[model samples]
Target chain A: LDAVDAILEQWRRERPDLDASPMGPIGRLRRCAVLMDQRLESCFSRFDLSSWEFDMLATLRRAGAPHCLSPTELFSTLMVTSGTMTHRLKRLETRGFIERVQNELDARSTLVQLTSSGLELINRAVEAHIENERQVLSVLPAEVLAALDTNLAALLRGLESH
Target chain B: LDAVDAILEQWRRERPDLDASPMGPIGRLRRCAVLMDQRLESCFSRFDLSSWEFDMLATLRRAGAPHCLSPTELFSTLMVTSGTMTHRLKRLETRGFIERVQNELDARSTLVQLTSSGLELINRAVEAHIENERQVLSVLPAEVLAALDTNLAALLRGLESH
Candidate 1:
């Protein structure tokens, strides 16, 4: 039994009338994600990056070419508020990792792009990050991993539909 | 088909050399949690509660009895830093949901306990929270949830062992 089991036990003893079974998978999902985040954050530290910074840089890099995107595009993909995206862009720009440039196609808009140093850092960082992710999941057998992927996808599908 | 599938496709086209398979489950795990958080947050909002507030109160409520715990106990259990717990406790104290009482057994330490109103709020909040959790997970078939839970437990076990 893990932390979630202990929590479930507590709920049972405390509120026996309420069924806390659903908390099992949901709690484990969250706690597992937290543990995963801790591992991912350690890898990000090697490149002097926070999780959010890595995410922002990776999103731009994933777009290819000039590695650019408008603030709205970035915020929408990153699932952050416009103000939050603006603040992150400011910090990234101050660090000389990204720059704001004129949007050539849309004169009314601004575009953010990774500078050379940012691109270089992220290129190296993504390789290491992917390697670390593989290492984290390597302990599980192939069958377990397959099951995890399928089940998670099913949950995402359900959530996405609603 | 899903956001993660789109992300995987982009990575395949852009960075074909790196196997982005591990990202599939990891990304879904995080995204699923985010969507779950959105649903949970909406439920909490109905009770005039934020996620953190709900967590703090729920942790206290789950403990039963006087529903009191020391700051260290609270932080350790909540997986938050001491300073973060202090800040949350201060806000909760101001909101009159909790009270800092003198620890009779240890004069050097202080204990936090839920006020009458706090107890009342948490009791009702927990009922709603549990029902909400049930509804959220109800979409997945039992077989899928069983696999999800088992695989999550395996992952957690591996992480804990290390």
Candidate 2:
């Protein structure tokens, strides 16, 4: 039996009234997600980028055209504090992955932009990252992945809206 | 569009040859798992328990009868440093959730024991935890959840082997 099954079995014998159905899947999902993260991060690290750094660069790269955003915009998507965003920007700037430019609408504010090298590195990183993800979930049938794709999409929409 | 969709769109426009198929769901899965952690932590904290402590108790409690195991065995599952294992054991002992006793046949070895109170608390805590999981995932169709349940179980096993 897998780890969660062991937990469920014990709970079954010990507490007949309580539901253990959700716990087993959840416990495993949380853990496997963690394991998956390690695999995903390893690919980014190979490109000399931490996951956070890759995310920041990718976020700007995806903005299209000028491809820049305020730290507050990044904060909204990243769910990190402003100070954390500031720290990340500083590190990325030092690495020449990102640069700050004066915001068009406000002289006091600056927008973060992806540098050419940052764009190149993140593109490479994304390719490797997804390849790693594909391999990590390679055990599952494509049908299963497809279901997860759709289900997770719906789940995310519901969750984010809530 | 949802976050992942938006990401995929950007990648497609930026890099015509690279595949982004696996990214959208994997991204959501990772983020949702992170959010679940926050929710799970809230539940654990409500009971004066940390996630690490809950994991330790549940690890011991799930083992039927005496609800005890050696630190080495715990280490095998936790995959944490021996130092971390020792620290967790010491904290649980301080909280009276577990007791360390010499193995009768081997004086040099110690096994962790779940106190009666520990068992009682984990059982209650697990019920609340699962109930909370159910609420958190209430957005998904039951069929989708069942699919995820089976899929995650197999994935965890396959993932562990790798």
Candidate 3:
């Protein structure tokens, strides 16, 4: 049993009235997320990137050709406030990873896109970052990873559905 | 394909030299972890407790009877600093959920333990907290949940082995 299992047992003994069913997956997922976050952060840290910066780049990179997106588009994917996204945009612009361009569709609006340097860096970073994730996930079987991916994708859709 | 899958497509297009293999699980995992964190926080906010407080009490409650552990044990298990633990302990102590008493045998320091109210709150809190988890996890089938638990459990054990 992991530490969460121990917690489940204690709850069973102490609060038998409660259904401890959620501890199995919920507690396990919490620990997994924490462990991966540290490893993933270190993985990015080696390249002088914070998880936040990596994400900001990745969002733009993955948006496909021209690699441009509106700040509104970013706020939707990032779940961050417009104010916070503005701060991130300024910081990345300073690093030459991204820039805010005039949104021709509306003069008052702006768009964020990757600089060639921004694209080049995340390109290298994604390869290594993924390599690091592979090492962490290597212990599990492919079928299991496949199952996790499929199920979690569906769950995210459900959770995200408004 | 999910958003990460679309990301893999972008990488494969723009940077054919790099392997885009890790995008699936790692990227998806990050989204799920983040979403659940928000969902879980909202779950607790309704109870007038912060996630930090809930975790502290749960850690104490799960450590078994008299619901006590030393500051050192808490530091190790919580993966936080002695100073940070002191802050958490003090904050919880002030709220009447826990108390620190001089260690009888180890007179140099003290042990932190839960109060009846802390115990009382978490016992109720655990049920509802987990019930909230169930609401999220319910989106997946038992087979998927079981596979997720078994495989991730192994990955977690492997990562923690050192």
* lDDT to native, each model: 0.85, 0.75, 0.76
- Give the Cα error of residue A3 in candidate 1, in Å: 1.1
Off by over 4 Å in 3: A76-84, A94-96, B75-86
Q: Please provide, for model 3 over A14-111, each residue's C-alpha lDDT reduced to its tens digit, 9 standing for 90 to 100.
A: 77877877767766666776777788888898778888898888778777779999976776654121236667779899999998899999998889
The superposed Cα distance between candidate 2 and the true structure at residue A67, in angstroms, equals 3.4
Q: Write the residue-wise lDDT of candidate 1 on B1-162 in tens digits.
A: 777887788789889999978888888988887788788888899888987898788778878888998877776565222235768789999999999999999898899898998999989998998899899899999999999999999988887677
Q: How big is the positional error of residue B55 in model 2, measured in Å on the Cα after superposition?
A: 1.6
lDDT of 3 by residue, B1-162 (tens): 656666677678877777767777766666776777788888888767887788888878877798889976765654111235657678889999999888998898889989999888987777788888888788777887887777667767866773
For every candidate, the chain B TM-score is 0.91, 0.82, 0.85
**lDDT per residue (tens digit) for residues A63-123 in model 2:** 6767788887776655111235667789889999888999889999998888888888877
Predicted structure 1: clash tally: 0
Residue-level lDDT tens digits of model 1 in A1-162: 887887889899999999989888988887787788888888999999998898889888888888888877776665212235767789999999999999998888899998999999999999999999999999999999999999999998898788
When summed lDDT is taken over every stretch of 10 residues in candidate 1 chain A, the lowest stretch is A75-84
| Highest-scoring model, DockQ | 1
